[PDB]
Design an enzyme around this catalytic site. Sequence first.
Site, short mmCIF file in Angstrom:
data_model
loop_
_atom_site.label_atom_id
_atom_site.label_comp_id
_atom_site.label_asym_id
_atom_site.label_seq_id
_atom_site.Cartn_x
_atom_site.Cartn_y
_atom_site.Cartn_z
N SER A 170 0.80 -1.19 0.00
CA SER A 170 0.00 0.00 0.00
C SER A 170 0.84 1.25 0.00
CB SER A 170 -0.95 -0.02 1.21
OG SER A 170 -0.26 -0.08 2.44
N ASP A 211 5.21 -11.19 4.02
CA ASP A 211 4.86 -10.84 5.42
C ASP A 211 3.36 -11.14 5.46
OD1 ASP A 211 4.89 -7.83 7.60
OD2 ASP A 211 4.39 -9.93 7.95
N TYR A 269 -6.88 -8.31 11.99
CA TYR A 269 -7.04 -7.05 11.24
C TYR A 269 -7.94 -7.31 10.04
CZ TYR A 269 -2.51 -5.68 13.41
OH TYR A 269 -1.46 -5.38 14.25
N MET A 300 15.38 -7.69 20.98
CA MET A 300 15.52 -6.25 20.83
C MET A 300 15.02 -5.59 22.11
SD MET A 300 12.89 -7.40 18.38
CE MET A 300 13.40 -9.06 17.91
N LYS A 308 12.75 -3.72 24.00
CA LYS A 308 11.41 -3.20 23.79
C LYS A 308 11.34 -1.68 23.95
CE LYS A 308 8.52 -5.45 26.47
NZ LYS A 308 7.20 -5.84 27.06
N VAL A 309 10.41 -1.07 23.23
CA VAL A 309 10.21 0.39 23.26
C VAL A 309 8.83 0.72 23.81
CG1 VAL A 309 9.66 2.35 21.81
CG2 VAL A 309 11.78 1.11 21.46
N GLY A 343 3.68 0.05 10.96
CA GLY A 343 4.66 -0.06 9.90
C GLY A 343 5.94 -0.80 10.21
N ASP A 394 6.65 -3.77 8.03
CA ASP A 394 6.87 -3.59 6.59
C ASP A 394 8.34 -3.22 6.41
OD1 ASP A 394 4.12 -3.91 6.18
OD2 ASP A 394 3.78 -1.74 6.34
C1 LIG Z 1 -4.55 -2.47 10.23
C2 LIG Z 1 -3.77 -1.87 11.39
C3 LIG Z 1 -3.25 -0.43 11.24
C4 LIG Z 1 -4.04 0.42 12.23
O1 LIG Z 1 -3.19 0.69 13.31
N1 LIG Z 1 -3.53 0.27 9.97
C5 LIG Z 1 -2.89 0.18 8.75
N2 LIG Z 1 -3.27 0.89 7.66
C6 LIG Z 1 -2.69 0.76 6.43
O2 LIG Z 1 -3.11 1.51 5.37
C7 LIG Z 1 -3.39 0.92 4.07
C8 LIG Z 1 -4.73 0.22 3.90
C9 LIG Z 1 -5.95 0.88 4.24
C10 LIG Z 1 -7.19 0.21 4.08
C11 LIG Z 1 -7.21 -1.12 3.57
C12 LIG Z 1 -6.00 -1.77 3.23
C13 LIG Z 1 -4.76 -1.11 3.39
C14 LIG Z 1 -1.59 -0.13 6.28
N3 LIG Z 1 -0.78 -0.50 5.20
C15 LIG Z 1 0.08 -1.44 5.76
N4 LIG Z 1 -0.20 -1.64 7.10
C16 LIG Z 1 0.32 -2.48 8.21
C17 LIG Z 1 0.02 -3.93 7.89
C18 LIG Z 1 1.77 -2.12 8.44
C19 LIG Z 1 -1.23 -0.86 7.39
N5 LIG Z 1 -1.83 -0.69 8.62
#
Ligand SMILES: CC[C@H](CO)Nc1nc(OCc2ccccc2)c2ncn(C(C)C)c2n1
Length: 307
Positions: free
Chosen positions: A7, A108, A122, A218, A220-221, A227, A230
């Site tokens: 994305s 991933d 998710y 690592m 922890k923070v 992100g 990714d």
């Molecule tokens: C889903 C969880 C997070 C909310 O904290 N949102 C989010 N939002 C994103 O925005 C793009 C998107 C929005 C709607 C449907 C599909 C992708 C992301 N693109 C990659 N990622 C992660 C897997 C790193 C994305 N994550």
Amino acid sequence: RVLSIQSHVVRGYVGNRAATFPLQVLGFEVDAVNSVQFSNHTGYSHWKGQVLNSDELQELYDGLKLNHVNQYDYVLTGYTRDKSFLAMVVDIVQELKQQNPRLVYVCDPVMGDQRNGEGAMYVPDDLLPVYREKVVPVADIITPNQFEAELLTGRKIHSQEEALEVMDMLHSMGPDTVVITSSNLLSPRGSDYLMALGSQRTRAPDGSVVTQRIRMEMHKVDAVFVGTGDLFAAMLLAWTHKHPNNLKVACEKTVSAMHHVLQRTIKCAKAKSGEGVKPSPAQLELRMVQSKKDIESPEIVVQATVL
Ligand SMILES: CC[C@H](CO)Nc1nc(OCc2ccccc2)c2ncn(C(C)C)c2n1
């Protein structure tokens, strides 16, 4: 070199915006197909944008075919919500496999996250079958959660050994490389850390076996980042590149860079937030640019152990 299907966000670093600078600043010719173009990740209060569908994705791959430029070194995918989109992606990755013997597929398998007890997905649950049945059997490197690993194998991890045996279930699934990028397991250094596991089973002369395994940890923070994963798979591609058969050597530098990127992020993040309020999703956005140097030249400030 790499065909990254992820994305895009106008602002911040998630998906392709998290994987292209690195892969580039490392020197990889990155070709990017934006699965969606959102204004920012869905962790901010509001958000708007568009998503790409299976036909549209089809359209673009098609374009690349006709110009006979569809030859790739690597293919990197991540978070998707459309089961069809994910499907379409598998077809593509196949052919691309016929053109170049083996352009490693780095996958991933984003499905959700774990907190000590269980997990929160998710994506809708129907994507599960596809990853398990169609996707994974073709990936050559995978970077799951503990949650994610459990979801794929169907086995719940209670200890470290239990963990190594779920990775094996993964290996036999296909990936000659598995890296549990995070877990609920306490570690030989206190809850002050985060433990991740790594195991590659390198076929070789005629003993037909070899399997390596290590364990980084690592520091922890104290924050919620979007992100990180990714950014993780991206660099893992970079490094496992220079050291094909050194599962250890890679993560080592890969994980290294993240502590840098993250603390500069956290540091700056705070610097912006007064001292009695949580940084917002906005200020927590990876100081990607500023880690211009860290990302490329790591301080190997982490180390692991084979087994
Ligand atoms: C889903 C969880 C997070 C909310 O904290 N949102 C989010 N939002 C994103 O925005 C793009 C998107 C929005 C709607 C449907 C599909 C992708 C992301 N693109 C990659 N990622 C992660 C897997 C790193 C994305 N994550």
